[PDB]
Paper text:
The DNA resolvases orthologous to the A22 protein of vaccinia virus play an essential role in poxviral replication, by resolving HJ structures formed at the inverted repeat junctions in a concatemer of linear genomic DNAs. The poxvirus resolvases belong to the RNaseH/retroviral integrase superfamily of DNA-modifying enzymes that employ a conserved metal-dependent mechanism, including the prototypical bacterial RuvC HJ DNA resolvase. The [name] resolvase (Fpr) forms a stable dimer as other homologous resolvases14–17 and was found to bind to various structural motifs on the HJ DNA, revealing flexibility of the Fpr dimer in binding to a wide range of DNA structures. The 150-residue Fpr protein has the characteristic architecture of enzymes from the retrovirus integrase/RNase H superfamily, comprising a single layer of β-sheet sandwiched between α-helices.
Initial crystallization of C151stop Fpr with a catalytic mutation D135N to abolish the nuclease activity, in the presence of a HJ DNA yielded large crystals that diffracted only up to 7~8 Å resolution. Four additional surface conformational entropy reduction mutations, K65A, K102A, K103A, and Q104A, helped improve crystal quality and the structure was determined and refined to 3.1 Å. A HJ DNA substrate, HJ 13/13 with four 13 bp arms, was required for crystallization of Fpr and present in the washed crystals. However, no DNA molecules were observed in the electron density map and the structure obtained was that of Fpr in the APO (DNA-free) form. Divalent cadmium ion used in the crystallization reservoir solution at 10 mM concentration, was identified in the active center pocket, coordinated by the acidic active site residues, D7, E60, D132, and N135 (D135 in the wild-type). In the Fpr dimer, αB helices from each protomer form the major dimer interface. The dimer interface is mainly formed by the hydrophobic interactions, including F64, Y73, F74, F78, and Y80. A notable difference is that the Cpr crystal structure does not have clear electron density for the helix αD, whereas the Fpr structure shows a well ordered αD helix with clear electron density. In contrast, the active sites and the surrounding DNA-binding surfaces of the two Fpr monomers are not well separated due to the shorter αB and the loop preceding the αB helix, and they form a larger flat pocket.
Numbering used by the authors:
A (entry chain B): 1 to 62, 65 to 92, 95 to 148
B (entry chain A): 1 to 92, 95 to 147
């Protein structure tokens, strides 16, 4: 089973891709990447989602130009075999949320990837990365 | 060529289906029906759009603050990379009731040129707002053709 969580944005989208092994009840992080959806966001989203052929897609619940992406994905995976689930954002002011997410990320990712240093060196801004990672985790917590 | 114009609404959706013959430069109305998208709007929209297998789909432009852009972009994703083109068109002044009145007048007087089935269309559907809207939207698209 392949899981695709997506922090949705135009200038700063991000996606985390997990592999779910129901046999071993374990979870392995495959890849988190920062994307760009400013030039033909439709084709960019289709590409980025179908790249790894996911079994389930997790979208962050958000008048914003991102609900169009939510429903574009919903229509794009409707007649397919991929389930699209929209989840709530994974307290305080809205500005504190990104800091809490980055802390939880930098402290929780080491259990899943073993590739922490290169992820931190490649991507300096950890907002959307942390958001997608925590969104995927919050979905999979309901599974186990 | 089959053209599908869609007046978008949850409790009051409507769709007009035209047949476009580029050879004869003529246009024939096939069917206009009022739909219901209150129970699983996703399945309802997929059903109503794939019903006649259209070559092009015409969608009404809606603001992001309206609960209908979700239907717009659901359709866009639903027909993406397919052989059906999805085009969003502008609404075909004053109050919404004056807009609907002008649309109903243009509809009730212009449909007879295309369907020959005016009397039964008027007898079946009493409220003509969204029906007229979808018909005029399809016409406004084909005028560009």
């Amino acid at each position: 089973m392949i899981i695709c969580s997506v922090d949705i944005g135009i200038k700063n989208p991000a996606y985390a891709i997990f592999n779910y092994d129901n046999t071993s009840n374990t979870i392995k992080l495959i890849a988190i990447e920062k994307s760009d959806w400013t030039k033909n966001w439709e084709r960019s989203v289709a590409r980025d989602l179908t790249r790894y052929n996911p079994d389930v897609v997790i979208l962050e619940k958000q008048a914003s130009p991102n609900s169009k992406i939510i429903y574009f994905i919903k229509g794009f995976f409707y007649n397919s075999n991929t389930k699209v689930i929209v989840r709530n954002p994974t307290g305080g002011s809205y500005r504190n949320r990104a800091a809490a997410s980055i802390d939880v990320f930098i402290q929780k990712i080491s259990e899943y990837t073993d590739y922490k240093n290169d992820i931190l060196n490649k991507y300096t801004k950890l907002d959307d990365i942390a958001n997608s990672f925590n969104l995927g985790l919050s979905y999979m917590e309901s599974l186990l």
